[PDB]
Amino acid sequence: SRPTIIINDLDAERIDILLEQPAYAGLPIADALNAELDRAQMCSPEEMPHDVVTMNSRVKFRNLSDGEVRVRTLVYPAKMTDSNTQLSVMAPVGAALLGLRVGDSIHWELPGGVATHLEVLELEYQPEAAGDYLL
Ligand SMILES: [Cl-]
């Protein structure tokens, strides 16, 4: 399991639609996100806690399997153009980071060969906190 996802109403809806795409049929991360969104804690973009990793946030995180640190911006697949700076929410690490708070760690093992162990070190940029309610 993983900690409950904290997400704003708009991204929750967009991801719900995203997961419906047949391109993601049978994918472990898609199935996992569907289940997690059903029990996610949602709120308006203005009510979003300032330390939560949200879509389009830039986050510094550590891989708990090897100690490696990286900075990546979490984006929707349509916007993923550079793997050295961006991370798809549909990729295991992106899905694992989504909804976590700075300071949280996650040890998410899913059947089908997917497992992520990460720690959120810093939230360099969060759209909600910057007023970019994207509305
Ligand atoms: Cl997957």
Side-chain angles (χ1 to χ4, degrees), residues 29-103:
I29 290 299
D31 292 338
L33 281 180
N34 264 311
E36 290 297 328
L37 290 186
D38 288 313
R39 48 184 131 81
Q41 175 173 22
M42 310 179 171
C43 63
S44 73
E46 193 182 307
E47 312 173 307
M48 237 299 145
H50 283 36
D51 60 337
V52 178
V53 178
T54 58
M55 291 303 293
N56 292 299
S57 289
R58 184 170 60 258
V59 51
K60 175 186 294 183
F61 62 96
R62 187 193 304 287
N63 188 328
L64 300 177
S65 290
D66 60 25
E68 294 292 315
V69 178
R70 294 184 187 185
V71 176
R72 294 287 193 285
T73 297
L74 184 57
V75 306
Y76 283 93
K79 187 176 188 175
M80 212 308 271
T81 62
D82 173 24
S83 60
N84 281 322
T85 68
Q86 301 173 310
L87 180 62
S88 178
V89 64
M90 293 307 300
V93 175
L97 292 172
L98 176 76
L100 296 183
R101 312 179 79 99
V102 169

Side-chain angles (χ1 to χ4, degrees), residues 27-29 114:
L27 296 198
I29 290 299
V114 180

